[PDB]
Design a protein around this ligand. Structure first.
Ligand SMILES: CC(C)CCC[C@@H](C)[C@H]1CC[C@H]2[C@@H]3CC=C4C[C@@H](O)CC[C@]4(C)[C@H]3CC[C@]12C
Lengths: 232, 336, 468, 53, 215
């Protein structure tokens, strides 16, 4: 099936250099806009870099502009993030994620497993609630307030919901606040308006607990929410 | 031995019966109805990606995506709003004479001059589209493919047979064989319960998807009929022929209602399709333009003349917001 | 301090030749040449010949009739101040240039002392200003007869008699008409089947023809009601110079830009056509079309280079008109700009076109020997026909470039002659009018005719391809 | 001659069909055609507000 | 535009470039529509050089494609327009079937129908008068008069074959636009491919010089 795996972890001395390689296997890698998203040891996700299909477009986060470089080798199905002068705030897991952009597509659908790499005027997505206890059987309502009208002139509200299970890679739940992901149960359903959003999970059950990150996609760099932990 | 004389007797009875229930002279009824005046449609977008003649198109149920098959050996799925191409499907047999698009928008059916209505799969993992099936069994050539569900597809071939397929297994579950000449066009119903096939015998037959028996046979044409489209009500259908006369048949009255012919038109029809209301009747001619016939008074309303070569396909959206004509220029316009 | 003791007599003539004398006593000591009143009057009426070129006459007249007819103060002649000299030294080097200022007029400290009354400012010459037939009164220092001050050469070149003008006008009308007709015919042929005739080298040929037609109609914007006069003549009554000036109207700037851009686009499209022919003939057979990718690059280069050239022309403002040609064109006055901006592009076009055409001919000559199979006589016939066609057309283009080069170089040398010759004529006319005369050598009109024949002939020869 | 038999059987099966008078069929066509004159964006050209093209 | 709309347009442009490149690569191969009556000997000529059947072969750095559509029983005029813009039309005619049943008359009628078609008004025709060896020995028994009552000449192969050739060549009513090349198929030689190459390169040179605006 679809399989994203990264390598080049371990511990590095500060101000050094390292290369992270994400070797894709089991999909047309030659036509997927691949991102790099990191996660601090105990914080939410943060966007790092992005490479488009055919290497025609590149972006970086403001923190890692000019310090990192992203490159893809299509014939080998690998994705490289060559990093230089590693600061003390880069200790994180680095997920390589695929994204395909056409009309009615589901970008950020599959997430790599990630490798722990230790060292020794944008939209702020204020996911206000940080923790809430729940019991199986009931429904809980998670809210994510944006800081800018995400409803574009096209009619879409570029806001995604990700679910990260304990010791897993976060999977896509809903894309553009309405559409369900591929192979997700019908319990999840998004609603709201511009600068206000909600993910109303119905008849919540076991194996559905974890943290829920809301990510705007209207403008770069992508800003994930602080995440709401569903404690059982 | 003398049975064809009895067949002629029955045919005479049929013609007498269908003539004895004819007193309207529809023009006589719609005389008092005020005309639509004159409609002018301007090409909003010029979908320009193909490098050879295009023979078929089909609008998605979304009324946004249209797929257009061509002779360069690619059917590419457009986005009619932003002109963007969302898929480029490199098909095997470059000779493609028809195209479909699943009502859900999951599958797209190809098929041309090699007896295989080969369906593709769009909404899949792994990115690129795959050949889900290659439905073989026909002995002529695929002329139309139309999706019933994501599992059933009817195909009208050039061996005088229309066949209902089964995508999952890939077998002819039902064979409709009543024609004598090539079946040039086919059109499903709003309820998708019974269709008609346009044949080279100058005769359209009313099939039944469930049973597999031709219920009614509509004659009146002089030459091959190249295009059929149902009236949105589902109780009438237009018929484009090589005699330059689009005709409105009626499924209830069992007979032709009216004919759409102008003396200064000599070219053959390639595609017909009603508007959403079923008032104006599009008709794609070989005069490098498609005329807009008022479908209740027979008088021409407008003209869509922006093509350098003959138009092969003409689709109306499921919300009547736009039409799309595809000529042998490799360009297909979206009028409005 | 600015007066000498001399016995002065009562005056007999009461005028400064324009202004009346306000006194009744005068001596003739100041004039080194003139000793008596009659000789003083003789010298005054000889100086009266300076009526033309008023930019110096208006300023010298007071000093003129002051040095010959002064005012004595009780056997003490009045000597004017240095300022009246310095006002009549810089711009009035013409008499110095031709005849020279006599030593009595060359004001030396013992002759003209510094800082005393002139007494002449009451004598003002309000009736001042004239230029005879070969000149016109002008108020622009840029557009004057540089050899003189004030007056300016008229619109119609005095080097050419009106007969030559009429002959050239009729010549231009006829050849313009023929070129326009051939180019319109080929444009009509190309546009009649435009849905079929879109094959690129043919379309490049169409663009050459269209450009040369625009050039031809740009030439034929004269013979109208009053177009020529508003194109080649200024409002003040001189020929156009150093256009676009910020004062005068953009009347012939448009007539210049269309004809120059048309000609340059024509020759550049021709170079691109020849290159397209070479690259096509290199891959004749093997169903491989190379130029399908670089069609747009051709379009942009050929449409850009003449435009940047003509804006570089309008940047340094020397574009000007001519009466005989009936057109504003670059570098009539200063031959350097004409030489560069005309011959360097045309010369480069000849070189590149020539090279690529010889390459094309050698290619489709060697094609038969290089082809693996045997060519049917029906194909080899057309290949040899088109080869001879390219050979003839190439020789014709080379001939036309050699003609225009020869005509220009003749113009350069004989023009370096005619400028001096014409000045000598103007001085001769001033001299005979002071106390007939003809220009020694004029431009031969046949070289003008041959130059315009070269241009129109090019315009025709670019349209003979549609002929089969 | 099984083709001729099948053709005659098809004509016999097609014979017993309940015909409706063209008056009523025409009236139904016209009635449906007139009842949807408002929801047809080609008859009445919708302004540049709603028109997505 | 938006974040995803720019990436959608980028994808659109990338696949547009892919279409352009594939079109440029597919326009370099010579197409050869292979007509001919049933049992004309199409199998012999198609094997000699290498629904619808596409055979791809290369000769002297040219890629040819032959679409022998005779394995399809439908109305020809409904799909024959699909093959307009083909380089040539290889029309192989059985020569030994002058006696068989009239079949020569059927081949002639098909040639007449295909050579004066609206779409193939421009496309040159190659015809292969194949099975010459059977025809050479078949003349001794059956004179040519069986097929052509209007024949007047010697009953030898070298004259009868030339008569058949000149009879077939006189069917095109358009003699100025389209040329009709002819070859008597050489069994044990590779000259059939050479003749096809020569005819195709000739029509290509003519089309390319017309394309070059000179002819
Ligand atoms: C490539 C060829 C055809 C371009 C030729 C450009 C010609 C028309 C231009 C370039 C230089 C110009 C000439 C230069 C100056 C003179 C001298 C003047 O006393 C008569 C006009 C005449 C003779 C000009 C006529 C127009 C002219 C000849």
């Amino acid at each position: 099936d679809v399989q994203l795996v990264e390598s080049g972890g371990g511990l590095v001395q500060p101000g050094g250099s390292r290369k992270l390689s994400c070797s894709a296997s089991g999909f047309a890698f030659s036509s997927f806009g691949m991102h790099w998203v990191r996660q601090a040891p105990e914080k939410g996700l943060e966007w790092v870099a992005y490479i488009s299909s055919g290497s025609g477009t590149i972006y970086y986060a403001d923190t890692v502009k000019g310090r990192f470089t992203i490159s893809r080798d299509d014939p080998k199905n690998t994705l490289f993030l060559q990093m230089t002068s590693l600061r003390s705030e880069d200790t994180a897991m680095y997920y390589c994620v695929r994204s395909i952009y056409y009309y009615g597509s589901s970008p950020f659908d599959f997430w790599g497993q990630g490798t722990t790499l230790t060292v020794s005027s944008d939209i702020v997505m204020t996911q206000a609630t940080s923790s809430v206890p729940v019991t199986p059987g009931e429904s809980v309502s998670i809210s994510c307030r944006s800081s800018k009208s995400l409803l574009h002139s096209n009619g879409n509200t570029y806001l995604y919901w990700f679910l990260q299970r304990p010791g897993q890679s976060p999977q896509l739940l809903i894309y553009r606040m309405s559409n369900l992901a591929s192979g997700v149960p019908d319990r999840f359903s998004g609603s709201g308006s511009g600068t206000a959003f909600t993910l109303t999970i119905s008849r919540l059950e076991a194996e559905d607990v974890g943290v829920y990150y809301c990510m705007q996609h209207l403008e770069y760099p992508l800003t994930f929410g602080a995440g709401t932990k569903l404690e059982l | 031995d003398q049975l064809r004389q009895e067949a002629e007797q029955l045919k005479n009875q049929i013609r007498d019966a269908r003539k004895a229930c004819a007193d309207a002279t529809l023009s006589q009824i719609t005389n008092n109805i005020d005309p639509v005046g004159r409609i002018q449609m301007r090409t909003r977008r010029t979908l320009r990606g193909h490098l050879a003649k295009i023979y078929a198109m089909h609008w998605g149920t979304d009324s946004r995506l249209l797929v257009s098959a061509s002779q360069d050996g690619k059917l590419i799925i457009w986005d009619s709003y932003t002109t963007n191409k969302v898929h480029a499907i490199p098909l095997r047999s470059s000779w493609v004479m028809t195209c479909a698009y699943a009502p859900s928008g999951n599958y797209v059916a190809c098929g041309g001059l090699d007896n295989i209505c080969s369906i593709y799969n769009l909404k899949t993992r792994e990115g690129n589209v795959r050949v889900s099936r290659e439905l073989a069994g026909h002995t002529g050539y695929l002329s139309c493919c139309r999706f019933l569900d994501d599992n059933q597809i009817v195909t009208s071939s050039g061996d005088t047979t229309c066949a209902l397929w089964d995508i999952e297994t890939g077998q002819q579950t039902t064979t409709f064989t009543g024609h004598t000449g090539d079946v040039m066009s086919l059109s499903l119903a709003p309820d998708t319960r019974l269709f008609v096939s346009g044949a080279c015998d100058a005769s359209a037959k009313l099939w039944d998807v469930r049973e597999g028996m031709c219920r009614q046979t509509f004659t009146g044409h002089e030459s091959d009929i190249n295009a059929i489209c149902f009236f949105p009500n589902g109780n009438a259908f237009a018929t484009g022929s090589d005699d330059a006369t689009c005709r409105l048949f009626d499924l209830r009255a069992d007979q032709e209602l009216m004919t759409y012919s102008h003396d200064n038109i000599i070219c053959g029809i390639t595609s017909v399709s009603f508007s959403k209301s079923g008032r104006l009747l599009l008709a794609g001619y070989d005069d490098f333009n498609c005329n807009v016939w008022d479908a209740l008074k027979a008088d021409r309303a407008g003209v869509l003349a922006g093509h350098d070569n003959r138009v092969s396909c003409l689709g109306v959206t499921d919300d009547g917001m736009a039409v799309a004509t595809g000529s042998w220029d490799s360009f297909l316009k979206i009028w409005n | 301090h600015c007066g000498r003791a001399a016995p002065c007599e009562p005056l007999r003539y009461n005028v400064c030749l324009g202004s009346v004398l306000p006194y009744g006593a005068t001596s003739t000591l100041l004039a080194g040449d003139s000793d008596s009143q009659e000789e003083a009057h003789g010298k005054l009426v000889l100086w009266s010949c300076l009526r033309n070129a008023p930019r110096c006459w208006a300023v010298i007249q007071p000093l003129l009739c002051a040095v010959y007819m002064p005012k004595c103060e009780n056997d003490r002649v009045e000597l004017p101040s240095r300022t009246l000299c310095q006002a009549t030294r810089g711009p009035c080097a013409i008499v110095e240039r031709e005849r020279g200022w006599p030593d009595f007029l060359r004001c030396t400290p013992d002759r003209f002392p510094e800082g005393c009354t002139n007494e002449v400012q009451n004598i003002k010459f309000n009736s001042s200003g004239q230029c005879e037939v070969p000149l016109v009164r002008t108020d622009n220092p840029k557009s004057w007869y540089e050899d003189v001050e004030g007056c300016g050469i008229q619109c119609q070149n005095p080097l050419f008699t009106e007969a030559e003008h009429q002959d050239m006008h009729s010549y231009i009308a006829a050849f313009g008409a023929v070129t326009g007709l051939c180019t319109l015919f080929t444009l009509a042929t190309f546009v009649a089947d435009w849905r079929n005739s879109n094959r690129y080298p043919a379309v490049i040929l169409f663009y050459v023809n269209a450009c040369f037609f625009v050039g031809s109609i740009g030439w034929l914007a004269q013979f109208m009601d009053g177009a020529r006069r508003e194109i080649v003549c200024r409002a003040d009554g001189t020929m156009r110079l150093g256009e676009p000036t910020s004062n005068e109207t953009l009347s012939c700037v448009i007539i210049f830009v269309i004809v120059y851009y048309a000609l340059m686009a024509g020759v550049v499209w021709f170079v691109v056509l020849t290159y397209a022919w070479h690259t096509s003939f290199k891959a004749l057979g093997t169903t491989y079309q190379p130029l399908s990718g670089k069609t747009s690059y051709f379009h942009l280069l050929t449409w850009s280079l003449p435009f940047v050239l003509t804006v570089a022309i309008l940047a340094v403002a020397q574009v000007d008109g001519d009466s005989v040609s009936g057109i504003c064109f670059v570098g009539y006055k200063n031959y350097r700009y004409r030489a560069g901006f005309v011959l360097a592009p045309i010369g480069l076009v000849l070189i590149v076109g020539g090279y690529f055409l010889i390459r094309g001919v050698m290619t489709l000559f060697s094609i038969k020997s290089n082809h693996p199979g045997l060519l049917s006589e029906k194909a080899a016939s057309k290949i040899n026909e088109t080869m001879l066609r390219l050979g003839i057309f190439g020789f014709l283009a080379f001939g036309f470039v050699l003609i225009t080069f020869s005509c220009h170089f003749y113009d350069f040398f004989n023009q370096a002659e005619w400028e001096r010759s014409f000045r000598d004529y103007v001085l001769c006319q001033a001299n005979v009018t002071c106390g007939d005369c003809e220009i020694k050598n004029r431009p031969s009109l046949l070289v003008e005719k041959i130059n315009l024949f070269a241009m129109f002939g090019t315009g025709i020869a670019m349209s003979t391809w549609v002929w089969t | 001659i099984a083709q001729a038999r099948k053709l005659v059987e098809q004509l016999k099966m097609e014979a017993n069909i309940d015909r409706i008078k063209v008056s009523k069929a025409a009236a139904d066509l016209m009635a449906y055609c007139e009842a949807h004159a408002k929801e047809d964006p080609l008859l009445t050209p919708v302004p540049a507000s709603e028109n997505p093209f | 535009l938006s974040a995803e709309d720019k990436a959608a347009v980028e994808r659109s442009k990338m696949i547009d470039r892919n279409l352009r490149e594939d079109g440029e690569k597919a326009a370099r191969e010579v197409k050869l529509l292979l007509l001919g009556a049933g049992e004309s000997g199409k199998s012999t000529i198609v094997k000699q050089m290498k629904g619808i059947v596409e055979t791809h072969f290369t000769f002297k750095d040219l890629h040819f494609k032959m679409f022998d559509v005779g394995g399809q029983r439908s109305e020809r005029k409904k799909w024959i327009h699909c093959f307009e813009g083909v380089t040539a039309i290889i029309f192989c005619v059985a020569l030994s079937d002058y006696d068989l049943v009239n079949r020569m008359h059927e081949s002639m009628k098909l040639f007449d129908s295909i050579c004066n078609n609206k779409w193939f008004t421009d496309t040159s025709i190659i015809l292969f008068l194949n099975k010459k060896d059977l025809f050479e020995e078949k003349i001794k028994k059956s004179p040519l008069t069986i097929c052509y009552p209007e024949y007047a000449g010697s009953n030898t192969y070298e004259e009868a074959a030339a008569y058949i050739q000149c009879q077939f060549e006189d069917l095109n009513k358009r003699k100025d636009t389209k040329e009709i090349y002819t070859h008597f198929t050489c069994a044990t030689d590779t000259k059939n491919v050479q003749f096809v190459f020569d005819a195709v390169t000739d029509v290509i040179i003519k089309n390319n010089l017309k394309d070059c605006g000179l002819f």
